[PDB]
């Protein structure tokens, strides 16, 4: 009874945090791959 | 015996009292174990 409510609130907080994490990852990985492709295509085009 | 009546009343009181004590212990122990398990499972799940 008091414990069910507690667990429910914890799960909700964790769901929001996973949401923020996905947002950050996208921006960092975007940059990394961007730079990689730039270096690659510039050199092949000569 | 002058004392026979006295002993019977003691017997009766003791029976009732044992009854009350069992009720209290259940409630206290319920709480204690409840809190313990909450702390344990929350941390393992995280």
UniProtKB/Swiss-Prot annotation, chains A, B:
Cellular localization per UniProt: Virion; Host membrane
Residues annotated as transmembrane: 18-38
Main location: virion
Membrane topology summary: Single-pass type I membrane protein
Ranges per topology, Cytoplasmic: 39-46
Sequence ranges on the Periplasmic membrane side: 1-17
Keyword annotations from UniProtKB, A to Z: Capsid protein, Helical capsid protein, Host membrane, Membrane, Signal, Transmembrane, Transmembrane helix, Virion
Source species, domain of life: Viruses
Keyword NAD: no
GO cellular component terms attached to this protein's record: helical viral capsid; host cell membrane; membrane
Task of the protein: Self assembles to form a helical capsid wrapping up the viral genomic DNA. The capsid displays a filamentous structure with a length of 760-1950 nm and a width of 6-8 nm. The virion assembly and budding take place at the host inner membrane.
Quaternary context: Homomultimerizes. There are several thousands of this protein in the phage capsid.
Family classification: Belongs to the inovirus capsid protein family.
UniProt-recorded name of the protein: Capsid protein G8P
Source organism (scientific name): Enterobacteria phage f1
Organismal lineage: Viruses, Monodnaviria, Loebvirae, Hofneiviricota, Faserviricetes
Gene name, Swiss-Prot/TrEMBL: VIII
Parent-protein residues present: 28 to 73 of 73
């Amino acid at each position: 009874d008091p414990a069910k409510a507690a667990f429910d609130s914890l799960q909700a907080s964790a769901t929001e945090m996973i949401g923020y994490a996905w947002a950050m990852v996208v921006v960092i990985v975007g940059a990394t791959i961007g730079i990689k492709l730039f270096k690659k295509f510039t050199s092949k085009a000569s």
